[model samples]
Target: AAHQEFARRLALFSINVYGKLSGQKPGENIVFSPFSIQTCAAMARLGAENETATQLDQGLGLASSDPEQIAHSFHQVLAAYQILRIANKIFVMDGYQLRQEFDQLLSKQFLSAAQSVDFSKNVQAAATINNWVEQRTNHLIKDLVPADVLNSESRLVLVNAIHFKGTWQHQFAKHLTRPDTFHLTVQVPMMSLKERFRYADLPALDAMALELPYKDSDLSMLIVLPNTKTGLPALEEKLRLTTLSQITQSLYETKVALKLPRFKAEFQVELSEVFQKLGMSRMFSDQAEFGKMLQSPEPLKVSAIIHKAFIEVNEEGTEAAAATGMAVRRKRPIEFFADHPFTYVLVHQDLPLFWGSVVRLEENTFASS
Candidate 1:
């Protein structure tokens, strides 16, 4: 029951994150994992105090004020995704040490540890963090924090990396796959499958929602489709947690035809601006406080929050990975061609594990130029 509450909050936060990201680039393919972002935030919250902690708590839609409760929520979610490979770490300047209380909270509650690095040696520091990301993500992600992102001034960097690869509960036949025109634009290879799935029609939102479960797990990919070619914008306009919950609740089991493109995509973003837009700006400013994280009198401001994600969706199932790092401040699809722009959520036990939109299919992967 407690996990569900946390899942609900996570779902809500996922939608909020979607809202912030959808319009930022406007017309580019957007894909990132909210679960990774939230993990970084939760780990950062371990070191927060006063207003900083409250901002993170509220921003994450956390129902509990206790930091332990928030961290435990992450533990539950992580435990549920056994196939998911995850690792979190707090990296401080070699000479600067983290507070023992914060280290204990991070390890005991969040399941992460603190490591010391000589950030003054920027190249080595970056490689150290990047190598961790690469290993934890099964090599799908590399160079998450570039050498330029860390420097002599950098005192702390918090990192979270995750990878998931699962087969479909019902596999799609490769023989049925063929080249098809996607949204009257690019001709691409499409995988076709027909099976019973949780489906719903929200005429109010003018969209169709389909749920395709992964093999041997509670996780499923939820695809929300708009009726018209230009419908994604309208669907996104009113997108929120309430609307998503309502649509999911109304879903009924039904047989349907599904066509999706075999696609692979990667996205990287600097999240400082996005976090600020979400009302968590205080953490990035000079007034920032992470007293619990470090013992130094110096006020630690998150210098940068970087994220990188990758996903490959084929007939076999899905392989998705994401990594988030807070430089101490640091903060899909669907079928139904995923052709045009559409939104998708990778869900586990009714909570969103990842969510994003695919606007342009990458030319190298599934398209002919």
Candidate 2:
């Protein structure tokens, strides 16, 4: 029931926003932050308390929240979405003990981008949000993420924080680290890294499921890159529905040649207009009907949905974990780089719920960038 509700809302959001953005099928490259996921879980618990199933159903539709924890998470995600779409800057600090310390926080720092409120230039909001999320997730993964994702903001700002540090198995020989070229549509940049990631292999899967152990073999990162470049899309299509049973069935201990890039990127996005263009027209209007989400007679509509993502890819593991605590909360340049060509996935045993992916960076079209 929970997953169903989450998927439904996500689908509606996409159809109402992303579907029109590219006129192509929408994809969610979200990497759930453990802290945030916990919050959502808590929300579910609260919703369970309501005797009226209809009321509960309505609440889930609006925010997929039922418990206070889920409500908190929803609030955080909504704030980030609003800032990325409407405000100037946004930030959220959500980690192990963050929720208890900060019940609900919001901020908009450095109004109008770092330079000025020059909302004149067109900003690549979508791509920027993607980048910001990547950076945040990678940091949680201990900096094993790779790529530059964030661009700049036009109006609002939002931020979410979730900080965590976990041990890994079969630690990388820091000495083995070296400069490697990362394949990117922008430009190939040399990044500090390591190689020969340990993992299990299976020919039947048509891919290599590499493992980067944290401390001991108890916890590790499962990096599944398609054997062939063409196989990548197929892999991601299967990934959204990935589960422990599927990955475990294909597991086999084997050796792999690993080349990871060390890179950082930030991005901002405006989602209100985007969503309206997609198909969720009601939320944008005062008459928008969302009575199911709340009992208040006061008008409550989604003004905007904004996000800023950050990620730095490298060897060892990922420091990737989005900090979306926006009440509210809060990118960059240079030789765009992504050497070689490959896709990556990050997973953990302790936290099976949160998973993420990184595709071989492709160049943004002239008009899109």
Candidate 3:
């Protein structure tokens, strides 16, 4: 229970990051794992010194948390999402090694492994890291380390990946699924299901929220739909000022005529820019300090904070017939037609596992029959 507050801070940080990333390209779709990003940031903090560490402490919104406590909090929270296949690695230039104390902290607190890779072989190194991540996530994500991301100057690489396969408790009916217009742009499969859900009608943000739990798990797909097709940007902005719990706590149990689109989106971005904007620029510059990571001061600084995410929603609950499912409904069912742009989050115990937006259809991804 003591660690719960830290989990909340992580959720708050997630909201801040989403607001920033979504603002950059207002017209495109975005999908990222906040948990993965937070975990990676913690790893970065462990090796960081001086202002770099200070910036990370603030950026992660754990300002009051001591480094040791931050590590323990993450260990506890990450453990709760048990089914998530989380893989972590910190690859240093071959022949270089982390300081003994730093290695022990990483291995003991974070349970992540360290390896040596030949960063001089840029192309091959990228392939090696990408291959490791792909295999770790069961191929849910690929090419996380772009060919151009790692260069001769790069020394250490930290990558975090999570493989989530959460089926819905209330699965959509396959027969009712058909192609429908998305934002009047293109036709894509639209799936519908009527189930009692925890919903909230927020006039303040001009958006409504719905919670759909996953099969036998604490994770839920919490989707926020704007009142108008073009209201997503406005809604996204308002979300930053509001705490995640405020939005999540407003949910009231009621039946919903939920109309949702089956979407698959993948986002890959080098977050050095995002980190700078979040006041973490020192870590990426030559003036940075990572003395804790290695014995020598070789002036090693992070070149890239690359992150990639992939998620899909389908009719099968992504599962079987027996798993098809709900809470009791109110007399009148509330209609939630998500035909246009909106936000979706794969939430685990109020902390977001994956957060994304569906602004428009890019392709016939998961093409309907």
In terms of lDDT, the best-performing candidate is 1
Alpha carbon lDDT of residue 306, candidate 2?
37
- lDDT string for model 2 (275-312, tens) is 34533344445444323322223323333443333444
Q: Which stretches of candidate 2 lie over 4 Å from their true place?
A: 1-160, 180-205, 216-219, 240-245, 255-257, 265-267, 270-296, 315-317, 325-341, 350-369
Using all chains and alpha carbons, the TM-scores for the candidates as numbered come to 0.93, 0.48, 0.91
Per-residue error for 164 in candidate 1, Å, reads 0.8
lDDT of model 1 at position 28:
62
What is the lDDT of every predicted structure here?
Answer: 0.80, 0.37, 0.74
* Per-residue C-alpha lDDT of model 3 across residues 1-369, encoded as one tens digit per residue: 556676587788788778778867667788887778888888768877788778888887763536677677767765655446776777777777688866776777777777777777878887877788877787766777766766666667776768887778898998999888888378788999999999999899999999988878887888999999889989988887787778889998998998888877767776777778888787767677776777766766766676777777897553100000000000119999899999988776667778889887845467675
Error of 2 at 363 (Å): 15
Q: 144-226, model 1: which lDDT tens digit per residue?
A: 98888778778888888888898999888998988876772877788898888888877877888888889778888888888
Q: Who wins the TM-score comparison?
A: 1
Clashes of each: 2, 108, 0
Whole-model alpha-carbon lDDT for candidate 2: 0.37
Tell me each candidate's RMSD, in Å, in order.
3.5, 12.1, 8.8
lDDT of 1: 0.80
Q: Cα lDDT for residue 307, model 3?
A: 74
